[PDB]
Backbone:
């Protein structure tokens, strides 16, 4: 049950965020592997550099490309995806 | 109580890193403190001190995968359970 | 002498910061979800298994010791 | 199947913190958070994912498909007891003394 | 010798269908299974889940270690006893 | 950190800094900046110069001795040299 | 509008001769592909300008990266400007 907490992307890309995340959950149990799955997917589809954080108790301070940022809860994992470079 | 866990950069800037995190704690040391404010402070300080494109990330449960510049990465832990990741890209 | 001409060239100019907040319910109000009595009824339905489990826990309360 | 029996469940001596979470991972009622609200959240979510893994193995290579979980009751003697009881919508968990 | 004695007694315990003695690695030393592949997946991944299990049981605090892990299901039973070097697993009817 | 050199007495080296820093503030796109530096340096000294502006770029050029100036101006980098 | 070419995106109508263009277009991705990577900086543009001076006319300048921009005079009809995979490349000749 994805719950977008703060997103900058277009609805279509957002849809892909939740979709790719669902796939990652479907296959990887470890948070790292989930993040790598997501990161690689968007980095391959689009081009540039994306980074993904997945956890449960966390804050951060990053810079990100306009319309290339999301902070959400999928199930109960906090996914923070964004594009820098 | 600083405990370096993953170091990649130079000693000097390491020392400054600890001092800056410390200062962030003092700046925000109350239950009402949010790790976010200190994160702002670390990123902006290392930007205005050692140049831009720094990222300050603080918390205790989180897995991360990022692209960082060599000799500009540090990760560490505190007796207070504060796991802080800092990196330049 | 060689002929000469002009040109100009560029690359697009775009990178903002927010601060992620650590987690601190799906519904904003907890009372709304807590108002379901049937939910507590389904929770109640576990005492059969719980009673059996409590009996089993007493049987395996202490591991065998030979010292 | 009612509050009366739920109260009885609470009356069962030996139990420390009961945790009931909808399969979505929402601890509805509790008696563990009544000592520390940061505990049932951790357990409920973590154990839910564990139950997912249990579903995988309970549907992988020996364990015939179409078979579901019934009860995954765990015990860490000297620490505490942790029962898991799956449901169509809930997950009755309870932290007792082994 | 204790392993031989325990293996023998599990074989003596009627209601057992598929025995599975494994080392701390994913090595099935002996198994009363129709197909081994079946046990290979379990014998390798369940140890990973036990890796996670020891992690969480200790995450509470280092007060206890995973002594036993016996799960019962509708069709059968999955007894698992983590040991220093081995893990005594057995598929039995949940009587 | 890097400052490749040019002629002596600060006839040219001194001039470029003073001009570049009017230039950086007064416009936003690089176009007017590089055009302005080049357009000034053609009138003052020489018949044909070359200028580059940016945050990041690789380059490697031929030129005339002691007429190659490179300096990191604020966040930006400015490159200048004569040729022709 | 940066029309597509079998090398990459090139601004058209071209302001360089077709043979010179084709030489640049094929040499850049060949020279990148064989024994060169993006981590290395100058030693690419080194090779590119050497290759142009060997066969074509002698005096070249090459500028490439991810952000820059220039005005410049150049010989008539000797301007090459192209992107490839979000990487700007620029080249021109002067007597």
Residues:
């Amino acid at each position: 049950q994805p719950v977008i907490k703060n997103s900058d992307m277009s609805v279509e890309m957002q849809k892909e965020v939740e979709e790719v995340a669902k796939k990652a959950i479907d296959y990887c149990n470890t948070d790292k592997e989930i993040a790598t799955f997501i990161k690689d997917d968007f980095r391959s589809r689009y081009h540039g550099t994306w980074h993904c954080i997945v956890g449960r108790n966390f804050g951060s301070f990053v810079t990100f490309e306009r319309s290339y940022y999301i902070y959400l809860y999928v199930g109960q994992l906090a996914i923070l995806l964004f594009k820098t470079g | 109580k600083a405990i370096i866990n993953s170091s990649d950069m130079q000693g000097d800037l390491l020392q400054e890193a600890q001092d800056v995190i410390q200062s962030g704690i003092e700046n925000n040391s109350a239950p009402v403190l949010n790790i976010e404010a200190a994160c702002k402070y670390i990123k902006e300080n290392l930007d205005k001190k050692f140049g831009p494109t720094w990222q300050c990330i603080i918390g205790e449960g989180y897995a991360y995968d990022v692209t960082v510049q060599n000799n500009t990465l540090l990760f560490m832990f505190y007796n207070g359970n504060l796991a802080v990741l800092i990196f330049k890209s | 002498i060689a002929e000469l001409s002009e040109h100009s060239v560029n690359t697009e100019r775009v990178k903002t910061g927010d601060r992620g907040m650590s987690h601190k319910e799906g519904g904003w109000p907890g009372n709304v979800d807590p108002n379901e009595a049937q939910e507590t009824g389904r929770f109640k339905k576990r005492i059969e298994k719980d009673t059996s489990f409590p009996q089993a826990v007493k049987d395996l309360k202490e591991g065998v010791e030979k010292c | 199947n009612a509050d009366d029996q739920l109260k009885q469940l609470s009356a069962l001596e030996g139990a420390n913190g009961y945790v009931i979470f909808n399969e979505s991972g929402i601890p509805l009622k509790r008696h563990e958070k009544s000592i520390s609200h940061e505990k049932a959240v951790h357990i409920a979510a973590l154990v839910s994912d564990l139950w997912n893994v249990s579903k995988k193995v309970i549907q992988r290579d020996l364990k015939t498909p179409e078979n579901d979980i019934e009860v995954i009751r765990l015990r860490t003697k000297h620490s505490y007891e942790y029962i898991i009881t799956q449901s169509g919508d809930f997950t009755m968990l309870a932290i007792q003394l082994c | 010798s204790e392993v031989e004695d325990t293996l023998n007694r599990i074989k003596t315990h009627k209601t057992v269908l598929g025995y599975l003695i494994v080392n701390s690695e994913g090595g099935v030393v002996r198994g009363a299974f129709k197909d081994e592949e079946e046990s290979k997946n379990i014998a390798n991944s369940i140890p990973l889940l036990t890796k996670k299990a020891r992690s969480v049981v200790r995450d509470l605090d280092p007060t206890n270690d995973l002594v036993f892990l016996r799960i019962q299901t509708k069709l059968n039973e999955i007894m698992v006893a983590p040991d220093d070097e081995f893990s005594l697993i057995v598929i039995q009817t949940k009587g | 950190i890097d400052m490749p050199e040019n002629s002596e007495m600060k006839s040219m080296k001194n001039d470029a800094f003073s001009q570049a820093k009017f230039a950086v503030e007064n416009y936003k796109f690089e176009n007017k900046i590089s055009s302005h530096i080049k357009k000034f340096f053609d009138e003052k000294y020489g018949p044909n110069w070359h200028c580059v502006v940016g945050k990041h770029f690789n380059a490697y050029v031929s030129y005339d001795s002691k007429n190659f100036i490179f300096f990191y101006e604020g966040q930006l980098a400015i490159l200048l040299y004569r040729k022709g | 509008q940066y029309k597509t070419f079998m090398g990459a995106r090139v601004l058209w109508p071209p302001e360089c001769a077709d043979d010179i263009l084709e030489g640049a277009i094929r040499e850049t991705q060949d020279a990148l592909k064989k024994f060169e990577i993006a981590r290395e900086g100058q030693k690419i543009a080194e090779h590119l300008k050497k290759y142009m001076d060997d066969h074509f006319d002698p005096y070249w300048h090459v500028f490439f990266g991810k952000n820059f921009g220039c005005q410049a005079v150049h010989n008539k009809n000797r301007f090459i400007y192209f992107y490839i995979e979000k990487t700007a490349f620029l080249m021109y000749q002067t007597q």
Remarks:
- Strands of chain E lie at 16-23, 28-31, 71-72, 77-82, 86-92.
